[PDB]
Design a protein around this ligand. Structure first.
Ligand SMILES: [Zn+2]
Lengths: 572, 307, 304
């Protein structure tokens, strides 16, 4: 089998390519300024050979893709951003593994692959849309089938059908070729919108290809039929690079990002909106991921740009599913409780219900009286209303206030210090309705006994409560005659409409109904044809209107503007 | 305006440019319209082009701006004053840009910016710079003297211009507008990314006919990206020479850096009996190539700070 | 005895938050499949879905309403490291306005400030940064500015403002941690706004709480002189933050400790007036609590 735990290895330069050997013991981390081969031990990992030993500060040997070949133990090939491809043979006798070089490419090469059985085949992807294949015969190094598309970004050969291969392009169309017939393609479908950066065949099934692209998508296509189809679509938070299937588990994908995200995720494909594991140790974008052996899923090797090679293990993950909050609660103005929780406590869906678990507030607000009567009559009316509603402890307070105020004798200020505490008692339980009501009823007698800030607090809290229930009438009746000056000025700001004539254009000044210049009766009704001296209604489109009641009646049975106009100032 | 007629030489580019302009200057976003016009004026005042500054002063005044801000720059909000040195760097020497400026920009305080406004500010600055370059390189009379069918200062350190060759250079294949730069903008600026991308593809669609097309435009692209310093990885610069000529190189390496000096005679001899449309196409491709490198430098500066 | 009437959300994944707006007649549900749904009340008496779209590219954790004065506005935080603001435009047209992209790791909570000091918004972050936004022009919802930022040196998982509307309580915020650190560092903190230095400052720390915190909620004031806070770590807890007469100094007290759940308590809420408190644990039941004029809290209902 295999053994080992999580590891690190701090490198010298950023790296963007990794490959593993058939022995499941070597890593071939490469990049722009480093090309090493590593041996991993159970405790640490030690460099075994530095392939840049014949060092030359030249661009001849960069790296953007390394592919290890499993037919022998020495055949290796690298892709350079100079457009040249350098293959290596570890069996060479001097300190230089270079075997054969190739310069049959226009601009650059991006991905290099082998073919599992035959050892004399080597594909290559370009930036010029010129994919090529090579051989071991030095003279024979050309098979230059091209797709009239943009830059190639990944080529892969199938597992079972060892005559065909796949390829992905920049515009977003995935193709399928066959080595025996390199003239015409076998399929082409538009996988993404934007480049597709990676692909990976399914180890188990006969034909199952997964492509990831810049559009933050991962799609798995079924190419068994004549026309392909999309089954699953995993949505990631950044552009997807280097997607790879896990071994022995046919429904898991390991995908890394190409920007922003530093983490590595494994998805369940069946459940696409939440991952299964979250490896978070890298402190920059990871660049390569490879499963160590294709027959033992426990270990994943993943180097990054932070100059680090890691071998994290499945068991020591950072799962987000078990660290979630499954439920949610909320109240309502009517005592309705909304409760949602997943159907494992009442596992990929949740059920919610509204529990129909302050009626007196509305009737108390409506039926109370706050002015227009003497003090005794107001207290009596409020007491009667409170008694009829069912609360007697509230009802007797009104009558006691009436007895106190609406009667040598007892000292005049006897109950001042005493009435002053009933306000606080009623306020410190959430019943601001009473406190505000009795404050309004009494006024100047008790005004200079409660701090101004407390008065503002009670007024504002009660006003907000009243407005929540859409009781605008009471909400304005509180503002109009509130004791505090700063509170009784809220409908006094930006509540004056500036109005001018639509004939002479000048602003109607003063308080009248006749234009200064036009000399006409501007405020003329459309239905009454009389003069409007009170409430005038207006239409934003028709620019018409008149008396409130007449326009109401007309719009109840008609649907056109009363002034002829023709514009239906209520769209159906 | 007059510039529209000259720019409308081809229809595959004018639509993209108009779309980007409408998104940048009129569509609602993280910054008020008056602020956008003010930073546009500040950006355009770096090459001392008066056509854009004149066209933008009226727009700033008509959109509820404060006349008091146009009596100089010291009478502007301190939040907008923190952008002066970044504008200075982006104008003519973008190689020397780094994390210190951006961290000072997003440093906590009272005039502290936010990362959803800085990106729009940078895009606007680069757009205005390259537009000024086009205006002074295809001279427009406030209608072009080039072909045929007051100002105050508003500047910090006006005696700073474009320096010599470049120093650690830039290997453009390690940072491309394709793989990752577009990804960063698509996340910071969701709508201003595809419009830039459409504009770039449009600038790459136009090809000349005077005598294999693509190689001619490649020479221009690589030459300007080198004079700014973006050194590529698949080019032999011995092939750059026998694609252009000195009669068509002083023009280009004068407009890209200091377009304030380009007179009638500076153009009078471009080359041959040109069709006068290929020359407009060449003066246009410079717009994209010059606004690309600065944006790449700024995006690299952004990405180093969030990593 | 409430009647549990169930509605079919048809969400393709879990549900993480439900919120009533200002009037008790519309609710908004956020799910883990990048969707936000809105349900309105009929005169018949049932909820029907009236709007649904794709919000983020991650997993939406919370959705909150704003005051009706500023319009019909919604906010949402997601695992894609952003935060958004939406408005309904008259049929059901919900349009995106801004994308607060300043975060680096994730956003866990999002809450609107009480609508007496502007249109202000506070977002948490798993890295431990609480940021406060603002919109000086109340009517452009595309122009948001960053005013303050607080670093709490611990993972952040909840947030809750102070609804007290009096001119005697400087605005303050409460943040809750979720770090399973071996050390018993305090996991609930309080910050308050100082009028003269224009800066948020640490006010008090709840040292007695050394267990992971999943929800934080203040109680509506409506005329009280002190403050009440509810924390759901592993048993429901209620605190008191009475101040001292003239940052400011509070004398914290413990008033309730209810292990009735025999599980981990996830979320809590307050009724409308700071009289009843709700709870939600792993047992799958909601529970209500109330006081008895001796400040002796006791259960007042069990709902399945
Ligand atoms: Zn009308």
């Amino acid at each position: 089998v295999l053994t080992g735990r999580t590891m690190h290895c701090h490198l010298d330069a950023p790296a963007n390519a990794i490959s593993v050997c058939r022995d499941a013991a070597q890593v071939v981390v490469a990049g722009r300024s480093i090309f090493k081969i590593y041996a991993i031990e159970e405790e640490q990992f030690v460099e075994k050979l530095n392939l840049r030993v014949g060092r030359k500060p030249s661009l001849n040997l960069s790296c953007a893709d390394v592919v290890w070949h499993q037919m022998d133990e020495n055949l290796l090939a690298t892709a350079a951003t100079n457009g040249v491809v350098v293959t290596w043979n570890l069996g060479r006798p001097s300190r230089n593994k270079q075997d054969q070089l190739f310069t049959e490419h226009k601009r650059t090469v991006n991905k290099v692959c082998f073919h599992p059985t035959e050892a004399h085949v080597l594909l290559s992807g370009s930036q010029d849309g010129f994919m090529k294949c090579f051989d071991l015969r030095r003279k024979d190094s050309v098979s230059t089938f091209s797709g009239q598309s943009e830059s190639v970004r990944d080529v892969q050969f199938s597992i079972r059908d060892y005559f065909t291969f796949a390829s992905t392009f920049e515009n977003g169309n995935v193709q399928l070729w066959d080595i025996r017939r390199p003239d015409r393609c076998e399929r082409m479908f538009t996988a993404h919108n934007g480049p597709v950066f990676c692909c990976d065949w399914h180890p188990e099934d006969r034909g199952w290809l997964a492509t990831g692209g810049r559009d933050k998508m991962v799609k798995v296509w079924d190419m068994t039929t004549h026309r392909a189809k999309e089954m699953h679509c995993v949505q990631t938070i950044a552009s997807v690079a280097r997607v790879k299937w896990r071994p022995e588990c046919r429904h898991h994908l390991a995908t890394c990002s190409m920007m922003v995200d530093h983490n590595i995720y494994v998805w369940d494909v069946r459940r696409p909106f939440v991952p299964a594991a979250m490896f978070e140790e890298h402190r920059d974008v990871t660049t390569g991921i490879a499963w160590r052996h294709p027959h033992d899923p426990s270990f994943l090797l993943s180097g990054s740009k932070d100059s680090s090679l890691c071998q994290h293990l499945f068991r020591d993950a950072s799962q987000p599913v078990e660290r979630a909050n499954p439920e949610g609660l909320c109240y309502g103005l009517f005592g309705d409780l909304a409760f949602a929780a997943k159907e494992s406590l009442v596992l990929a869906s949740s059920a919610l219900s509204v529990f129909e678990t302050m009626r007196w507030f509305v009737d108390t607000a409506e039926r109370y009286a706050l002015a227009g009567r003497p003090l005794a009559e107001l207290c009596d009316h409020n007491a009667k209303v409170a008694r009829e509603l069912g609360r007697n402890q509230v009802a007797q307070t009104w009558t006691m206030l009436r007895i106190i105020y609406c009667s040598s004798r007892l000292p005049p200020d006897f109950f001042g210090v005493l009435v002053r505490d009933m306000l606080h008692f009623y306020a410190e339980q959430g019943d601001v309705q009473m406190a505000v009501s009795v404050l309004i009823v009494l006024g100047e007698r008790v005004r200079k006994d409660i701090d101004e800030q407390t008065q503002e607090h009670w007024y504002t809290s009660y006003i907000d409560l009243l407005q929540r229930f859409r009781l605008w009438n009471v909400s304005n009746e509180v503002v109009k005659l509130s004791t505090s000056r700063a509170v009784s000025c809220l409908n006094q700001a930006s509540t004056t409409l500036h109005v001018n004539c639509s004939h002479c254009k000048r602003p109607m000044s003063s308080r009248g109904w006749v234009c200064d210049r036009c000399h006409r009766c501007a405020s003329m009704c459309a239905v009454c044809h009389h003069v409007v001296k009170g409430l005038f209604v207006w239409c934003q489109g028709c620019s018409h209107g008149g008396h409130l009641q007449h326009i109401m009646k007309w719009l109840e049975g008609s649907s056109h503007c009363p002034a002829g106009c023709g514009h239906l100032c209520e769209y159906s | 305006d007059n510039l529209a007629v000259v720019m409308g030489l081809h229809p595959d580019y004018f639509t993209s440019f108009w779309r980007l302009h409408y998104l940048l200057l009129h569509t609602d976003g993280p910054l008020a319209s008056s602020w956008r016009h003010y930073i546009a004026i500040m950006a355009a005042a770096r090459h001392q082009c008066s056509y854009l500054v004149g066209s933008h002063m009226a727009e700033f005044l008509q959109t509820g701006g404060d006349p008091e801000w146009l009596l100089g720059l010291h009478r502007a909000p301190e939040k907008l004053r923190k952008l002066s040195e970044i504008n200075k760097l982006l104008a003519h020497r973008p190689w020397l840009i780094t994390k210190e400026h951006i961290q000072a920009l997003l440093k906590t305080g009272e005039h502290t910016w936010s990362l959803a406004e800085l990106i729009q500010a940078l895009v606007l600055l680069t757009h205005c710079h390259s537009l000024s370059s086009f205006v002074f390189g295809c001279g427009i009379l406030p209608p072009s003297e080039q072909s045929s069918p007051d100002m105050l200062c508003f500047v910090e350190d006006p005696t700073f211009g474009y320096e010599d060759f470049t120093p650690p250079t830039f290997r453009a294949q390690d940072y491309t507008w394709e793989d990752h730069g577009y990804s960063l903008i698509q996340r910071l600026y969701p709508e201003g990314g595809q419009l830039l991308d459409e504009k770039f593809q449009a600038a790459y669609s136009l090809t000349y006919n005077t005598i294999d097309t693509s190689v001619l435009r490649r020479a221009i692209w690589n030459y300007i990206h080198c004079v700014f310093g973006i050194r590529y990885d698949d080019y032999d610069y011995g092939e750059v020479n026998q694609l252009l000529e000195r009669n068509l190189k002083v023009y280009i390496k004068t407009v890209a850096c200091y377009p304030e000096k380009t007179t009638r005679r500076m153009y009078n001899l471009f080359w041959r009996h040109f069709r006068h449309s290929e020359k407009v196409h060449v003066n246009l491709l410079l717009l994209e190539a010059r606004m690309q490198a600065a944006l790449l430098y700024a995006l690299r500066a952004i990405t180093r700070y969030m990593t | 005895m409430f009647v549990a009437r169930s509605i079919a959300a048809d969400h393709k994944d879990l549900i993480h938050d439900v919120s009533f707006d200002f009037h008790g007649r519309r609710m908004a549900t956020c799910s883990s499949d990048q969707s936000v749904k809105v349900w309105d009340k009929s005169e018949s008496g049932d909820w029907h879905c009236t709007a649904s779209w794709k919000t983020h590219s991650g997993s939406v954790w919370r959705v909150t309403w704003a005051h009706p004065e500023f319009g019909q506005v919604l906010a949402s935080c997601s695992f894609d490291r952003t935060a958004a603001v939406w408005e309904e435009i008259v049929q059901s047209h919900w349009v995106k306005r801004t994308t607060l992209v300043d975060s680096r790791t994730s956003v866990t909570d999002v809450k609107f400030a009480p609508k007496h000091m502007g249109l202000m918004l506070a977002t948490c972050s798993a890295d431990g940064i609480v940021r406060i936004y603002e919109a000086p022009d109340v009517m452009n919802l595309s122009q948001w500015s960053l005013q303050h930022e607080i670093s709490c040196k611990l993972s952040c998982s909840c947030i809750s403002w102070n609804p007290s509307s009096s001119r005697a309580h400087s605005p303050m915020i409460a943040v809750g941690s979720d770090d399973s650190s071996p050390n018993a560092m305090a996991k609930v903190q309080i910050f308050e706004y100082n009028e003269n230095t224009r800066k948020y400052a640490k006010a008090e720390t709840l040292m007695t709480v050394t267990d992971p915190v999943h929800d934080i909620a203040f109680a509506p004031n409506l005329g009280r002189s002190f403050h009440i806070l509810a924390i759901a770590t592993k048993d429901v807890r209620i605190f008191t933050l009475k101040p001292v007469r003239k940052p400011t100094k509070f004398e914290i007290h413990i008033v309730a400790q209810f292990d009735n759940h025999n599980s981990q308590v996830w979320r809590v809420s307050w009724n409308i007036t700071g009289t009843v408190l709700a709870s939600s644990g792993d047992d799958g039941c909601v529970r209500l609590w109330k006081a008895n004029y001796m400040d002796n809290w006791k259960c007042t209902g069990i709902l399945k």
